[PDB]
């Protein structure tokens, strides 16, 4: 039987006798030479891989075929190894037994690659998010990769360390797309920091966890709100009659209120009133990015 087939573990060490070929009565004949003439290395994609003639060897005398250099399925998933045997001075008198042997050698997978995060080298994701993002908005998409065959490198994504629970979720437990299932608010959360965990479906499962920091950006989405709904012969001219006050639940100059009135007179800073009402946020920025409430006063 010249043409055999044998499977091997990629983790199988050098020298590990994988196979054994013989001639008929190779023991009646001690003067036989077994030789590896060519090696043909290919991917799990059937693609071809050059310069792999160093991968196996044969014992010249016994024809036991063993590994010579360490393998890796993620580089080469199958070899076709060609062998000859040479009778010394007998058959084919002037000296080979052809048909040659074709040993087919399939490399069985060991779950030895643990998931990586694209882009390669990433320690953390940070991106920057603007509030009011609608629930079911893709907030950020991470992803990851496993080299190993079938199960051993089917990647599945888990989400941990979730700062307020229930705020975001993976839409689908087989893709690192983080959606929000609560409308995004700076006036609740300044940071949605969580930890994404990709894992293979390996016999003992290998995985990886990496943090995901999402910086939450303020927008002018809160009016200034006044304290009271309404604030109600001749005194001295400067003396202050009453202060008013409003608050604006945003932060970065989107809280600075400019207090103003129709008639009299006012102070934009304090909200104080003198003698001869409105609140407006974000001064120094265009009207269309401002908001306001109006109180009455007697
Ligand atoms: Ca490997
Ligand atoms: Ca592998
Ligand atoms: Ca794996
Ligand atoms: Ca808000
Ligand atoms: Ca805001
Ligand atoms: Ca505001």
- List CB-based neighbours of ion ligand 1 within 5 Å: 72, 74, 112
Residues 49 and 61 in one domain: yes
Domain boundary among 218, 237, 252: 218
Ligand 3 centroid to residue 108 C-alpha, Å: 13
Resolution (A): 3.5
CATH number at residue 137: 2.60.40.60
Question: SS3 for 153?
Answer: helix
CA distance 38 to 53: 6
Q: Which of 109, 47, 98, 38 is nearest to 74 (CA)?
A: 109
The closest ligand to the CA of 184 turns out to be 4
Residues 226 and 267 in one domain: yes
Domain that holds residue 262: 219-298
Residues 261 and 189 in one domain: no
H/E element, 128 = strand 125-130
Ligand 3 centroid to residue 199 C-alpha, Å: 8
Structural contact between residues 9 and 108, judged by C-beta atoms closer than 8 angstroms: yes
Determination method here? Answer: X-ray
Structural contact between residues 211 and 124, judged by C-beta atoms closer than 8 angstroms: yes
Q: Which of 119, 113, 110 is nearest to 210 (CA)?
A: 119
Residues 157 and 170 in one domain: yes
CA distance 293 to 297: 13
How many domains is the chain partitioned into structurally?
3
């Amino acid at each position: 039987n010249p043409i055999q087939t044998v499977s091997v573990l990629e983790s199988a060490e050098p020298g590990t006798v994988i196979a054994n070929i013989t001639a008929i009565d190779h023991d009646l004949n001690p003067k036989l030479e077994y030789h590896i003439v060519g090696i043909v290395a290919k991917d799990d994609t059937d693609r071809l891989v050059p310069n792999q003639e160093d991968a196996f060897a044969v014992n010249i005398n016994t024809g036991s075929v063993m590994v010579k250099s360490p393998m890796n399925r993620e580089l080469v998933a199958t070899y076709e190894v060609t062998l000859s045997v040479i009778d010394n001075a007998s058959d084919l008198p002037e000296s080979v037994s052809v048909p040659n042997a074709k040993l087919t050698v399939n490399v069985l997978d060991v779950n030895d690659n643990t998931p990586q995060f694209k882009p390669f080298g990433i320690t953390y994701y940070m991106e920057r998010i603007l509030e009011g993002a609608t629930p079911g908005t893709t907030l950020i998409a991470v992803a990851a990769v496993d080299p190993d065959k079938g199960l051993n490198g089917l990647v599945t994504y888990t989400l941990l360390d979730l700062v307020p629970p229930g705020y975001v979720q993976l839409e689908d437990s087989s893709a690192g797309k983080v959606i929000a299932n609560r409308t995004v608010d700076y006036e609740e959360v300044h940071w949605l920091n969580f930890t994404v965990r990709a894992s293979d479906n390996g016999s003992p499962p290998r995985a990886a966890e990496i943090p995901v920091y999402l910086e939450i950006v303020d927008i002018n989405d809160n009016n200034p709100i006044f304290d009271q709904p309404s604030y109600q012969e001749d005194v001295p001219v400067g003396t202050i009659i009453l202060t008013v006050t409003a608050t604006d639940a945003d932060s970065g100059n989107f809280a600075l209120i400019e207090y103003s009135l129709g008639d009299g007179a006012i102070n934009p800073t304090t909200g104080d009133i003198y003698v001869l009402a409105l609140a407006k946020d974000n001064p120094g920025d265009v009207a269309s990015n401002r908001r306001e409430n109006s109180v009455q006063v007697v």
